[PDB]
Amino acid sequence: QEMWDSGSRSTIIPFFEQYVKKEAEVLDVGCGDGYGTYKLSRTGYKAVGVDISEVMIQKGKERGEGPDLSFIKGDLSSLPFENEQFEAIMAINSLEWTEEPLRALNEIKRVLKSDGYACIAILGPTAKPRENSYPRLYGKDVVCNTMMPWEFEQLVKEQGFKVVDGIGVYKRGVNEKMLGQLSTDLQQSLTFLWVFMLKRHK
Amino acid sequence: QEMWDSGSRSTIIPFFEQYVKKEAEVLDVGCGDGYGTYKLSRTGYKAVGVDISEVMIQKGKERGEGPDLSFIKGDLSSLPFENEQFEAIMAINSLEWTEEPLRALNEIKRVLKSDGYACIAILGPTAKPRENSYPRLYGKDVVCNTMMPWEFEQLVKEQGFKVVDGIGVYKRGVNEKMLGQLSTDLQQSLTFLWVFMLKRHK
Ligand SMILES: [K+]
Numbered sequence: 345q346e347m348w349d350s351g352s353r354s355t356i357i358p359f360f361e362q363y364v365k366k367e368a369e370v371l372d373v374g375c376g377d378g379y380g381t382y383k384l385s386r387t388g389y390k391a392v393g394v395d396i397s398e399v400m401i402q403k404g405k406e407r408g409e410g411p412d413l414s415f416i417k418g419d420l421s422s423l424p425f426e427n428e429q430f431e432a433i434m435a436i437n438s439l440e441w442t443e444e445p446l447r448a449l450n451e452i453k454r455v456l457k458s459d460g461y462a463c464i465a466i467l468g469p470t471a472k473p474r475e476n477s478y479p480r481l482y483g484k485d486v487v488c489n490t491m492m493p494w495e496f497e498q499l500v501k502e503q504g505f506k507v508v509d510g511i512g513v514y515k516r517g518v519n520e521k522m523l524g525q526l527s528t529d530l531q532q533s534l535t536f537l538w539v540f541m542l543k544r545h546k
Numbered sequence: 547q548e549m550w551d552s553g554s555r556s557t558i559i560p561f562f563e564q565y566v567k568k569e570a571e572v573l574d575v576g577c578g579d580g581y582g583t584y585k586l587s588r589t590g591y592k593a594v595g596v597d598i599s600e601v602m603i604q605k606g607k608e609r610g611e612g613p614d615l616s617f618i619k620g621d622l623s624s625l626p627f628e629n630e631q632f633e634a635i636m637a638i639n640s641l642e643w644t645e646e647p648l649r650a651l652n653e654i655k656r657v658l659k660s661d662g663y664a665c666i667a668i669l670g671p672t673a674k675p676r677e678n679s680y681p682r683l684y685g686k687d688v689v690c691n692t693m694m695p696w697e698f699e700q701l702v703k704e705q706g707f708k709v710v711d712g713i714g715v716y717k718r719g720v721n722e723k724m725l726g727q728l729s730t731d732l733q734q735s736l737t738f739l740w741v742f743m744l745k746r747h748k
Pocket of ligand 1: 490692
């Protein structure tokens with residue numbers, strides 16, 4: 345709610361709109377409560393939200409399903425969709441919460457139409473949610489993996505994706521002045537999250 | 547050589563000198579070729595360098611051992627020294643190159659005199675050497691662990707260390723102006739490495 349309207353995810357859809365033409369079908373991978381999915385439908389896209397949590401899915405369906413908004417329960421590492429079913433995909437901080445990010449990335453690739461866009465956000469190095477990874481230093485199992493924005497960037501390129509753009513969502517204390525002097529990796533280092541705009545290679 | 551005279555490690559000893567009184571004995575944990583150890587002796591400390599590589603140790607002994615400079619081959623997770631043998635310790639990027647950073651940190655604590663200082667540097671998130679960690683995304687074993695500066699900071703505090711100061715060694719494109727507006731974690735995010743000044747709790 346707050347995240348999408350004025351929070352850390354409030355600039356994602358406008359960025360998405362810069363590349364993905366309206367009416368294109370979009371799959372929201374790891375949609376959670378489905379508010380982002382809802383926002384996509386409100387912007388003019390036919391959106392489908394997928395998440396492993398039955399509770400989350402029911403939560404999204406309560407928003408009102410229609411010809412432009414639907415939700416499906418599913419495993420992110422085994423998406424219940426056909427190859428190239430979606431013209432576009434959005435995956436906001438879903439890849440950090442798996443022990444097998446490459447497996448999940450390959451599924452995103454599979455269901456995305458060749459030459460289609462994939463908008464994927466990855467948490468910055470100091471983003472608070474990453475504190476979940478800390479216990480690994482004591483030998484404990486953790487849910488949030490340590491794949492950084494720049495590591496994901498390279499991984500996507502090695503998996504058949506072209507990175508065409510990207511924007512940061514910066515933490516308090518950062519200004520546009522200091523940014524326009526830093527290489528991309530350092531800009532990503534100062535973020536709460538980085539939003540990549542990828543394209544599945546044709 | 548270049549690293550210590552004008553490179554990424556050229557501001558470490560001056561920082562060390564701000565806290566550790568001369569003549570104090572210092573152990574250089576993971577001394578490598580021992581140039582840093584040599585520099586410590588040149589600054590006025592009685593330095594001992596320890597490293598697992600027999601080749602590296604012989605390399606350091608070639609610099610000329612004396613009453614203020616010596617080298618010993620040893621396992622960083624099983625230091626061949628007595629409890630509280632050293633009044634001060636320096637560990638420059640040695641903790642990132644082990645699969646068990648906590649084990650190594652506890653050994654550093656053990657050989658350091660209570661209330662003594664430990665100068666420890668940790669690579670920043672985008673430091674090039676961390677590319678060694680990348681293959682883990684393909685399920686491969688890697689030498690460089692992913693423990694970040696801020697994670698180490700918390701780990702040291704939970705292990706009986708007080709963090710009293712710290713300085714960054716920044717990558718090209720960063721200026722002091724933008725820094726004085728960022729919280730410590732973001733300053734660390736923009737570094738090639740962060741140098742912590744710790745004290746073993748009494
Ligand atoms: K890791």
